[PDB]
Amino acid sequence: IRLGCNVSAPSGVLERVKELMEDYSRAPDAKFQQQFRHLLSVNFEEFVAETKERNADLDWVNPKLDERLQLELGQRQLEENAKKRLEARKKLPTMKYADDIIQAVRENQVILIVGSTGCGKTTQVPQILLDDAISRGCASSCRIICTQPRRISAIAIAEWVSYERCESLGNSVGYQIRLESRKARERASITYCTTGVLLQQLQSDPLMHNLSVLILDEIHERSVETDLLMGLLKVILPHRPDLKVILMSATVREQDFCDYFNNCPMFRIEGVMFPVKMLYLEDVLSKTNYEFQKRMKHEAMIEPYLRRIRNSYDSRVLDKLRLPESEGCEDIDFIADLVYYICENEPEGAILVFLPGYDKISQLYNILDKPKTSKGQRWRDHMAVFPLHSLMQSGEQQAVFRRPPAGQRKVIISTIIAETSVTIDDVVYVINSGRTKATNYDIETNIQSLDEVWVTKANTQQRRGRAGRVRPGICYNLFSRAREDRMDDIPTPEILRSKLESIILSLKLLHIDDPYRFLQTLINAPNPEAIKMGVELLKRIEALDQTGTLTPLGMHLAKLPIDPQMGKMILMSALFCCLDPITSAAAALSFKSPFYSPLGKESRVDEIKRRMARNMRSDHLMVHNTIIAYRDSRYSHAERDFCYKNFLSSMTLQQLERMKNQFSELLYNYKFLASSNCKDAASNKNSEKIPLLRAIIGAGLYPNMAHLRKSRRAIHTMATDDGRRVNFHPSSVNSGESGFDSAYFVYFQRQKSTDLFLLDSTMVFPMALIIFGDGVEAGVTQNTPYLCVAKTYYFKCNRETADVVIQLRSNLEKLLLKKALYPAPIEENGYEKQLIKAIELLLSLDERL
Template sequence: MESNNDEPRRLDGRTVSGLQQALREQAIRAMNRGGRSHHGRGGGRHRGRPPGLRGREIGMFYRQRAMEREQQEELESFVLLQPEIIVKVQKMLSEYDSASTSTFRSEFENYFKSIRSTSFEQNMKEKLLESCVEQDDRLDEKMMIEYDEMMDNLKFQENMITREKLPVNTKKEEILNAIASNQVVLISGDTGCGKTTQVPQYVLDSYLSSGKASLCKIFCTQPRRISAITVAERVAWERAQHLGESVGYQIRLQSVLPHERGSITYCTTGILLKRLESDPLLNGISHIFLDEVHERDVNTDVVMGLLKEIISHRPDLKVILMSATFNTSTFSAYFNNCTNIEVQGTLFPVTEFYLEDVLEETKFANFPEEVQRKRPKWEKYRNKYKQSDSLDDYTSFIEPYARSVQDKYSKFVIEGIKNPNSEKINVDLLTALIFHISFNKPAGAILVFLPGYEAISKLHTSITNSKFYSAEKFKVYALHSMMPTADQKSVFSRPPENVRKVIISTNIAETSITIDDVVYVINSGKSKMTNYNPETKLQTLEEVWTTLANNKQRRGRAGRVQPGICYHLFTRAREFTMDALPTPEILRTRLESVILNLKMLRIHDVAQFLRKLVSVPDDSVVQTSIALLKRLNALDEREFITPLGLHLARLPIDPQIGKMILLAALFKCVDPITSVAANLSFKDPFYRPLGKEKLVDDIRVKFSKDTKSDHLMAANVITEYREEKRKGNERSFCYDNFLSISTLNQLEKMKGQFTDLLMEARFLESSDPTDPKNNYNSSNLDLLRSIISAGLYPNVAKVRRVKICKRRVDPRMDIITPEDGRVSFHPSSINSKQTGFEYKFFAYFMKQKSTAIYLFDTTMINPRALLIFGDGEGAGFDQLGNHFILLGDSFRFRTNRVSAEVILKLREKFDELLQKKAINPGPVDPESEDALLLGAITEVLNAGRFSGHPDYSSDEGNVM
């Protein structure tokens, strides 16, 4: 180890120039030592060789040792801070008020004591000591009078006539008896039987009429926000009441709560999970209805697992599961073979037609022929994991079917279904079918099921631009989960006479939501589904075929007011290949958000809890998710939740995206970072026409504006689109730059949703992403790239060497990641088009393996950002006495003592700031000590490169 004389002395009394010279000399000495250790000749090499090696064995030994040394050099870099920056930052740190740290640390420890040290089981036992709800005779008498008045209401009596015609009414007494006699009851019924709206009312009315209303408080969960609102409104209407009386709803950021007792609250499943954090026994709630359990979304599966634990402590709590009629045995068996009551479904019969019938009826034959073109290998593999059939697979099942029905259909129909393109979403066919129904079929609304927002937008445009369309004859609505609630609710209004209503929806209209006047359903047979690949550690949103269960649900949307018709835009042959049931979401999704939610519920051994669910996720996925949360600093080494983890658990989005937007709020760069977050959460706004790929790539590079970032390129696109939209030029702007206007509009809406979340968490004063108060640092390029890297961490790659081909970077350059070894920039990444880089490190969101491992989107990042926002074991010395900071368990940065101290001090203080914000969330005051700390971090991130050694720039700096 080097003597103390080789270390820089303390700053006290030393000038900046003197310190700078000392640091330069130390860097040179350190690098020279490193050079001798790796490249020395002579006896040293032989002394390291094991005895007894001969001939080829000696060569193999030195080859292996050279490979190990090369790997070590690949993962090692230099980071040194300039002396003037050290002086400035240390001064700022000394001014940072440490007195408040001890105060908020004490509050923090008290706040987290129960979460970190009390188990879910212990928490339930503690809550048992709290007083339970007691019967209130005076309240019961008052509510009985109100109930009698409701029964006498003429509007209520009119509505009751309709309610009594619902199929579920035939099982009313059986259902009430089963609930009274059992703690858990499963009610299964087809779509339209009335179970969602009627059964909770049966229970409430039984308490009201018997004078026990004060003992009744019903919560009914829905998988979607719009379902909770519309069902609550429907039930209140049936009871001739306003929302907020005996019926109400609660969703994130919006609620109309009913009476505290003698009431029904429709809520999202996530709201019930949040309530469990503070009230694990659900004290005061008498009945929990879990609706649509057959959908198998993650939250519902988790709630079922929790309720299975809770009911043994709450014998008075009634749990009613409500499901479609398929696969009910799974839920019954999970709750110890609980009672199952089946209810028949739709009111009127529904006639089904398939693609071949649709083509015969509409005479449509305009399917594009297959275009064969030579594609680059990377493009062929880009959508490798999307569900699709090869041409041979399609032919193998469609040819025999086509021969079997060739005498039943016209020749053009047979040729049409043999074309593989007939199975793709065809806007022209959809438009033709909608107008065919409108002009040739009796009155009734048309409900079209499409897989996503983009398809909805295209069909909406096609209908409204058609020569057959007129605003006086048609009302066209879009229904999508990301649309504002007010827009979603408009689809339930009935149009004037002789006006055809068309609703274009995702599977949001498949269950719970009932649009009463729908008579015609058009089922595209496609939906969007999340899928997680544990090998690539990537989660994707893919367009897939629906299941038989989905098709049954969609068909059931017709026939509510009269016999209905369902048009399936796939052949009967395709239906034979469809799965029976959808895969439970917990088996095809990342689990970081689930794990954080469980930690907030004080479930410390999440792996053990997840093994108790209806469907058990793969243990490797669980462990991978836990490892990622540790590296994000959301969990500590003992798997306890951290301050940052607390914030991320409160944000209902992916933890990596959540960390990114939270840091954006702290550092005041909300507009560009929410653009990045929206782009990563949704999709890229560019489309790539055949033969125009290179032109699109060049446009993407233009938008990147030398940021060396695919992510900031997308942010620049959104900013310019917003400006062009203000001028009224958005359509020409999008056309000229191969941009999807519908995607850009959706990205803008998502930005608003992100800022709403930050406002709800009290990190922002304004929910406007462009508010200047939110964007003091939005032009600071190094800071923006640092925050992107903090969010995407630990997805980090390092460039070893750069190859130049035709004055551009060869995308096959030497890039490595610790877990994969050599990788490459994807040709579509703007960084594959650059001529040089300032830094060697890159953050990425998506990688995929085909002929090689490709990084699809990348951002060049300052290695100092990794050291401040990353994880690691802190500073130390190598065998030669060189200072280093370890990033994770992979990258090692050689430095000096003072630089290491400053960087690690900033990391420590920033962790303390997150603790402080866990207790007292709020925007950072520009005049506060918190702003001083963030300013010190920004100074380090913005600092120029240290140029005291001619080789230094090849490590932290320019890699060309």
Template sequence: MPSYSKKELVEMINANRVLVVSGETGCGKTTQVTQFILDDHINRGIGSTCRVVCTQPRRISAISVAERVAAERAESVGNANSCGYQIRLQSRLPRRQGSILYCTTGIILQWLRSDRLLSSISHLVLDEIHERNLQSDVLLVIVKDLLSLRDDLKVILMSATLNAEKFSKYFGNCPMIHIPGLTFPVEEFLLEDIVEMTRYSPQNKDRRSSWKRGFWQGRQSRPEKEEKEAEYKESWPCYARSLPVNLEGAILVFLPGWDNISSLNDLLMAQQMFRSGLYQSDACRPHIIIQLDITIDDVVYVIDGGKIKETHFDTNNNISTMAAEWVSLANAKQRKGRAGRVRPGKCYHLYNGLRASLLDAYQLPEIMRTPLEELCLQIKILKLGSIGRFLEKALDPPTTQAVNLAIKNLNDLNALDDEENLTALGFHLARLPVEPHIGKLILFGALLGCLDPVLTIAASLSFKDPFFIPLGKEKMADMRRKTLSRNSKSDHLTIVNAFQGWEDAKYRGSRYEREFCWDNFLSANTLQMLHNMKGQFAEHLMNTGFVSSKNPKDPKSNVNSDNEKLIKAVIVAGLYPKVAMIRPSHSKKRVKVYTQADGKVCIHPKSVNSEETDFNYTWLIYHLKMKTSSIFLYDCTEVSPFSLLFFGGDITIQKDEDQDTIAVDKWIVFRSPANIAHLVKSLKKELHNLLQEKICNPAPVDWQNRQSKDCAVITAIIDLITTQEKQSGGGQGYGRTWAPAPRGSHLHFDDDDDD
């Protein structure tokens, strides 16, 4: 950062309650502004009154920036020095006064539960606010209200240059200051320039079909663009191959997803000059980095594919969609900037001037394109009033339809009552740092004595899958994942098995741990993160009274952890109503799968169930449903009728076509003798009352006292769930008692689209 700007910047911060600091990535604002504030206070002899907290959108950013600032101050991070960091599950805190703390936005929201005024903070620096993630937009609303309650709080908003005025206007036209960047000049080329440079002329029309399935599967929102986009689809691979030739320095290729990375890698490896290793090992030749969106220090050339994977939430159909969208001008500018960090660079945009003129200024803010249930619970536990009225104050408010849908879903989950108050269950779900369905999964795992495996599942669903897929080894990775499933027909239990295998290997020694992870395509870092998250969840459960130990493996909390069928039932308790029905396919290559809302859907190819044909039951529970090229179910588990009856929705008993039936939420229907159906309904009511009591008054289940009512009820249900498969004999027959009801109006089937 230029030294001449320091004095002006400090004077403006001291003179104003809110200031917008704009500057491009790499200008130094993240590391320098906080130090300017602290040093100014120390020089004026009031250092003890200064506590600067700077938010970061990512965990890794908070750590790396804190380490850099500490190094500049000739200190170590934390250890009661002047600079530290705090992120989820990890912290190295600085001294209380006269300090700088870098933290994730979620940490600030967590502090607000116990200190609504953030009274210990003198300066709140909100960094990278132009990224517009969900938490930062919510924090902006809270901070705007907080300024009316604290006249001593200073707020510094740090943003990219393009939309600084929008944030200034949101805070009453507060002043702005711009910090010039220090990047090298970058020469830009558009598609027409590249065509001329490479003298490219399409020859093989067959290339179109293979590429079309991957990189160019965006949404065709306007028909008049299709002809131009067809040209891009056809020509992109050849440009990607042509551009690296005779270049020196690292080449960074921006692609929107893993399938695109894999496709381009295959295209490059098909060329002898890339297979020879010249582009990876020879220091005189460039190395090619095909990646999504991280910082690489020695990049000189950028190839911008012009697309970015973006998730949207369709409130009309209650489904998430993911597609490769055109980048925004802000994205394109950021990508270009990666080429000018170390010396003058070049950026090749693979779209033409017309497309460039049609690009939006920014991507749609996350608050306008994601489900809002978790956010709604946070609003209620922070006591911020009406959900709708609070969100109306956002910089870009979500639609009323999206807000109402989130509230309805929380009502259905029994997390909010009809007056929008938190229920006992909602209170616990709001305090857990996960989305509501996963929070419910955690609570039921504790109550039903299978804590350790359920926490593994919950940690994975709320963080990420520990498996990775190396380029060129996709089939082998799928085989290893399938082996780890142990025929459970469950992605969730596959991760449990992988995690337990990792723990066993780690206990034997670091060499065994490395070998296990290498052989099974597992990330040791991700597994360690899941381990840490499990500890956090267990500690939270102990503090709220659900379990008696913060050890996830405590025997008292795991009396049923070896019961695979019960674990599947707990997954139903957490993820219901995300249910799909399985039907055999005439082709016998794979089954057909249907949901109530969508009709025919597909199991995602990554799932261990994607090519399974021999299921024991006709029902799947899944974590995520997303529309890309088709509607895919992610992370699914085969579950039994009893699991759905006891842990699904409301039960109704009726005669249907001269048969007695029992139905869950009127659409998951089974044939059943009336006496058994009434027994199940009565037992479910007892279970519901017991669980409500435990949630209202948390206490561990006393598994030693088998005569107690709570233990007797739970044990009876566990016995029914556990013995059902043995009684039914397995396979697609299911036994007479629990066969699915005949096909009728419950689901829409399409028999004309055999696989």
């Protein structure tokens, strides 16, 4: 072993820490504790038993309301601002099935509706179920929940359905998403929510007694949430004979779902869509006959196909198809050329280019903006070009959705983001390169990767769909039909790629204590070894004992709507009075960063960040400083001018702030704070003590450590605690920096792309790791006295410190156990604070001078 720096502490510091610790050791409530032991002490049937009493509002109906609504439905359908849309709504395909759906719901607990774009299932099915109940004089027994994957969907659909009923939002229709609602009346109502909303409500209503019809939408996307929720319905439905579930799906492996609920009824409702012709690589080449400019397999693949098509393509269009580079988006000039070909032949209408990511979007944009080509600068000032990317701003504007200045043709360069999430309406032409990026997880290298791959059949049929919303259009797929037959049906179901810590933990609140056995029953079962890794992580942060059973701290973490590691971070920040900065770090990790990356300004966004970082060498503290600066700009009425000069999204910034306030109100209700204000003075008296902040951050992100080793932009020799070589991601504020006060870092996500990168990081000090971590041992290996952490990092430490530190840990552990089991704010002049002050004092030794 090789020893790191000395962490020994001054005598007079040690002694005061010893006075403080013994002040803590001298001292001589519990509604939470009783809920905790109650959860552990009941079986499943008692659990089901008791959640039914406590949730029985729908057993009560209001007959005078049933009859009045029923009267006003019969009468509103004779008025006329209410049969335009009855005629209009009845020209949607779903309405042809109205009676048949009603009948199918009546006869079955679970039906499946399979539809496609335009079919109207999402807007009409809940209105058919509702109106059926009002008409039959059953209004008040009817509460309908329709889940969506996305926040924006939930809103727009609710508004539209509400508009179709000539009601303001809040009446028969509403929506609910994280921290924003327009709730509908309790009974005779339809509510559109994100799936995760419902899944959090399960904790209070684990058997869904508080709704009559559940409509799961868009399940074919195989999000973790709908996958989880279909798996839970298999537990819930046997004890809820009268609950109705309608599954709804696009035409993307529909039979899987049908098969999953024994073999339930299935409707196929058609979409409303213009014809779109599908040209493949051989056909695009055959019309542009562009030529290309300076592993096989690739003609092992391409040549049996090339024969079956000897007769029907030109001489050697068969050419380029032998070129590996002809497919995908290797050659951006090919693509730019196809943009030009569409610009002069084929009538007007926007072009939508699908490229795998930021880099290629950038190349193609520059090639149009400053062109080499003869047929480039003719067209330059007759194209309205927008790049479209999650990290770019143009999406959340409006200039991209409205049609172009006349004489100009709109061109959209985009990631997969325009497949479902973002919709442009004058698109007539789609160039589908067939290339995208996806995250992947190797289960026993622990490397998460970001890889360019071929799209799926599912992605292509959707992309094609995007061409035909306003008029017959065309989808150009820059790969060959031989490529397509190698392509997969659908993406990998995200639950097969995800970490399961929060899922395993949250199942405990639903009285599902065996994660292996429940998870195994999903449409696609996760690798059991991933589950194991999940459990060990929760065992390590002590959310579970080593039986696998919930700890008092684990219950608190389960109840916070954030990943457990960052929950632990937030609770700790309540104890050590640093709520505001840490909840910022927490919120930004959980959601995303408020910075754009607008094309070409990479260099000066880099410079904004480094300035916001204030030399604190922390991506996480940089976001907090950003929020501090944001708050002031608002106080100064300079909000827009601030967000503009600093490449920041004001709407990410506000959402970050609603999240922090959510964590502060929750922490108050759980009795960790005396105030629900995230900015409260008492809650924040240590929020400027940067070494302390680093410690609590480290407390959350532990055990993700990394250690930098050499000098020398600047080049780095850094390796995570597992031994693997990493570098700071260049988007991170620590990339290329030199002269850190410490060689140690914590990180939330590591990700392999061009290299194995730490996506985010905070410089931490050895003593902070040692106090809050584990694997702490005091020994002598050379003839030096050491003190270690995680049995991985060994620091020189005299033994008078090793002993105070080890005692400090023993006290820190006892205190944390007791705050979890009997939550109360830490009294400012009580015995517990003494121990807090003890820890603060040791950590202050590493203040930057």
